[PDB]
Structure formats: C-alpha cells, structure tokens
C-alpha cells in the first residue's frame, strides 16, 4: 500500500553526482593508462557487472586503487563514468567504438545494446 | 547531444538497496533509541538535509555511529530509510504522525509535503 515519489531515484543520482564533483566520500581511484578517476565503489557496483564482481571480492573490496586493462580508452571510460552518475550517454561517431568496447569490458549491457544498434544503422 | 537511459536512476537505486540488504560497503550505523540501522553515508546525504549537513562536517564525516534525538521514533526512521533506498513510502494512519515528525527532523521536504496533505484531507 506504499505511495511512490516519481523523481526520487533521479534526485538521489543527481546528489551522488554532486558528491563525485566535490570529491566527497569517494573511496576508490580507477586508473586507466595515464588518467585517474575518483568514484564511489557503491555506484560503480550498481552500474557495472565488472565492478560488482571486483568489489564483492573479499580482497579487492578493500583496495583504494583499481587498474583497468591497458587496452581501455580513458575517454571511453570517462563517458561511461559520467553515464553511471547521470543516465546520460555522450555517444558520438568519433567515440562510439571506444564506448562500446569499454561498456563490454565493464559489463554494462544496456550501453552495449544501444552502441550495437547505432553501429548497425550506419552500415 | 547525449542520449538518456530512462530506467538507469531506478536501476542504480535498486542495486544500492540490494547492497544495503546484504550489508555491503555500509559505512555507518544510525542509532534510534534501542534500534540500529546500517546504511551508506552517500545515500543518507543524497536524501536528507540533516545527513547532508552531518556528513559534510569535517569531524562528523568520519564517525561510524550517529545517534539521533531520543524523540525520534525507530519505526518512523525505518519507513524513511526504506523510502530513501526505494522511492516507496509506507504511509499509514497509524504511522503518519511519526513519519512526518521524522521527515521534518531529517529535512526530507517532499515527504513532509505529502504527510501535510494526507493529514489535511482527514481533518
């Protein structure tokens, strides 16, 4: 018999992104080649099958630094990290291949789906 | 020029609630009289003006235990904590006064608004 506040989940996510911008309570640095990205482990797990696996591991759960595969593109990661915190995906002709490869590695199925559909439409 | 995934914010919140149920990466215990509630500081801040103030404080940000005012009702807190993690508010005739008082203390304006409207309709 609950009532539901339609905008609540979006409002929570907006405030999680504000915390990220102000670097408040971030508990991990994701290293992608020469670049570093601070984030909240809980948000990374909630968005990515890869981080969900990493941070439920009894040893990796305690790491403050996670190094991604050297084949991962920093811009592609940056676009996906912004997506995690905003629901908005900056998908462009110049970045779509890197975004799709990064989303496959991060196990972000919905992003992979759409990248596949956008590529199929251009061929 | 971003695209947006409509269900993303709801999916993030659902996974944050799963983390809470499994007690994964919870970093605070909220003590309300004889009861204890484990939560994620980032979610509490994102939902509540009171926790936002508490956890941006340079000393309180590091506390693992937060004790609420003894006038706060544990059930009222439990209902609001569930709301924070789900967008669903279990508002009932028997709990509305406690929910509204707890939402005023926690500075959860949207919950306060609706409690006020539901009370006005019954008088």
């Amino acid at each position: 018999s609950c009532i539901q506040f339609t905008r609540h989940a979006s409002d929570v996510l907006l405030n999680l992104n504000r915390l990220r911008s102000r670097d408040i309570l971030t508990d991990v640095v994701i290293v992608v080649s020469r670049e570093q990205f601070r984030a909240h482990k809980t948000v990374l797990m909630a968005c990515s099958g890869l981080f969900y696996s990493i941070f439920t591991d009894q040893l990796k759960c305690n790491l403050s630094v996670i190094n991604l595969d050297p084949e991962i593109n920093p811009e592609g990661f940056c676009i996906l990290l912004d997506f995690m915190y905003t629901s908005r995906l900056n998908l462009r002709e110049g970045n779509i291949m890197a975004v799709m490869a990064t989303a496959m590695y991060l196990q972000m199925e919905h992003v992979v789906d759409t990248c596949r559909k956008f590529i199929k439409a251009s061929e | 020029s971003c695209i947006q995934f409509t269900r993303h914010a709801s999916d993030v919140l659902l996974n944050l609630n799963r983390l809470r149920s499994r007690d994964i990466l919870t970093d605070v215990v909220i003590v309300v009289s004889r009861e204890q509630f484990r939560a994620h500081k980032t979610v509490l801040m994102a939902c509540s003006g009171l926790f936002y103030s508490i956890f941006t404080d340079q000393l309180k940000c590091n506390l693992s235990v937060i004790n609420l005012d003894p006038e706060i009702n544990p059930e009222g807190f439990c209902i609001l904590l569930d709301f924070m993690y789900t967008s669903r508010l279990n508002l009932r005739e028997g709990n509305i006064m406690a929910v509204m008082a707890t939402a005023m203390y926690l500075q959860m304006e949207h919950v306060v608004d609706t409690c006020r409207k539901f009370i006005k309709a019954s008088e």
Partner: peptide, 4 residues
C-alpha cells in the same frame, strides 16, 4: 507522488 503516485500509486505505483
């Protein structure tokens, strides 16, 4: 607020 809505009836979900």
């Amino acid at each position: 607020w809505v009836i979900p």
